[PDB]
């Protein structure tokens, strides 16, 4: 087994994904037009209520809308071809080698079979935990696999959304650590604040995380 | 209305898919090792079957559900999304393309799923060529209604590789269509497809002889 393994989450919390949203919206809309735009996020806002980030069904669905507009399909190219190294926040590859001397660090992130692992690995956060990556279409219903894959007497989870520490927390217990970074819009967002239970850490950054050795009870 | 229409496939019509395949299975059997690839392409092949095209995508989810903690092998993705498209063109598309644009609206009209299908026509060069007539369906051959909305033509020529949508199209258009098939690519050497189907209205040895299309 392992003392400890290490679980990030990679959406806000080692990578900065609302300026990556940001910057896709504001390019979908000057190629595509407004009104074009403006419905598919309609579409990937139900989709994003029913799952995370669904890019995907989103433009399935928007096809069988408007079969004619094949040109707004090309927004993959904004996301395939985004600089997203750019995008890893400060200190979140310190934190990752800092930790991952003391134990494994794994990524395990909800996605798509196309976008999240791109990002992942042209991120270059794929390589940083030597390919040590789960993706999930929900990641708190298979804990029993991220078990076996990473077996270890403790575990860590950092995760922007407390909704999901709070499940597994409910399914782990004393056997987790969950640490919630500051960051993103889930972080502020009243309902998610308000109906979980509290992370046993809050940090403001993810490069806090290195001045607490001392919470990992090592040897 | 226009007197005429040209509307083509892309796979193995104005692009050489087979030697993208064959790049594409090699890098899966050099990187994801032998079993994984094995398994990803018979799930290929199925939806293959029953879709009637080659969905990567769906073939790509069906793999997760059945290898979840195979991550690595969804990074096959990545050879497709930057495979150079334009030096799979076959010689004399372009000129066809570029020729018989002259004479009316030049139009892609490809089955296809949202991600790969598409970058691949942009990509390629193929899409700004045909200056972004381009309709990428499920089944196409379920959606000319469509395509004539978008392009009213008194009469539309279709290239494609498969004498199965030909068929189903000429059933649809009759005399209003000219179909043509260009020996390229496997379905061109199929005793399946030859035999299964009728013959198109023309049948040319390159996509290049098209030039010579001045009705
Ligand atoms: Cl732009
Ligand atoms: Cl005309």
Redesign the interface.
């Known amino acids: 087994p392992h003392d400890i393994v290490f679980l990030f989450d990679c959406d806000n919390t080692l990578l900065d994904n609302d300026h990556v949203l940001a910057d896709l919206r504001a390019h979908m809309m000057r190629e595509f037009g407004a009104q074009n735009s403006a419905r598919y996020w309609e579409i990937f806002e139900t989709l994003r209520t029913e799952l995370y980030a669904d890019y ?1 069904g989103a ?2 669905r928007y ?1 069988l809308e408007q ?2 507009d ?2 707004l ?2 927004m ?2 904004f996301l ?1 071809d985004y600089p997203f190294a750019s995008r890893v926040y400060p200190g979140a590859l310190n934190a990752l080698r800092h930790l991952g001397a003391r134990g494994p660090t794994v990524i395990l992130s909800d996605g798509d ?2 976008f999240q ?2 990002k992942i ?1 042209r991120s270059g956060l794929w390589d940083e935990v030597e ?1 040590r ?4 279409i929900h990641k708190e219903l ?1 804990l029993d ?1 991220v078990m076996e ?1 990473y077996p270890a007497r403790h575990y860590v989870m950092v995760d922007d959304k407390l909704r999901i520490l709070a499940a597994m927390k409910k399914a782990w217990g004393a056997r987790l650590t969950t640490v919630f970074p500051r960051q993103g819009h889930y972080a502020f967002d009243p309902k998610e604040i308000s109906s979980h239970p509290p992370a046993d850490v809050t940090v403001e950054r993810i490069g806090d995380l290195v001045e607490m050795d001392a919470e990992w009870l090592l040897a």
């Open positions: 995907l433009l399935q096809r079969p004619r094949t040109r399909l090309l993959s190219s395939i079979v196309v692992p791109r690995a390919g990556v789960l993706i999930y298979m696999q894959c």
